[PDB]
Every structure is written in C-alpha cells, then in structure tokens.
Amino acid sequence: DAEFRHDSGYEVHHQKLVFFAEDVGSNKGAIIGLMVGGVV
C-alpha cells in the first residue's frame, strides 16, 4: 500500500498536497506533530 512515486526533479515538488488530504481523512487532532498551530 502507498506505492506512490511522486518524486520531484521530473515532477512537481508539492509532495505535501497528498498528505494535506490523506491526514485530514486520517485525522487525529494532528497530535502526530502536536504543533500544527491549534494546540490550545
């Protein structure tokens, strides 16, 4: 699973976009970073 090959150089450097959606779906109060910008 997750056999992505969105490797830049000969591709866009917006490797953030993917997670920026997948993480929302797999929400967890963003505790994974615990510094998202809303830790009360």
> Cα(23)–Cα(17) distance, rounded to whole angstroms?
10
What class is the 1-40 domain? few secondary structures
Residue 8 in contact with residue 15, Cβ under 8 Å? yes
Method: NMR
Residue 18 in contact with residue 11, Cβ under 8 Å? no
34 labeled part of a ligand binding site: no
14 labeled part of a ligand binding site: yes
10 labeled part of a ligand binding site: yes
Nearest Cα neighbor of 23 from 36, 14, 8 is 36
Residue 36 in contact with residue 30, Cβ under 8 Å? yes
Residue 30 in contact with residue 38, Cβ under 8 Å? yes
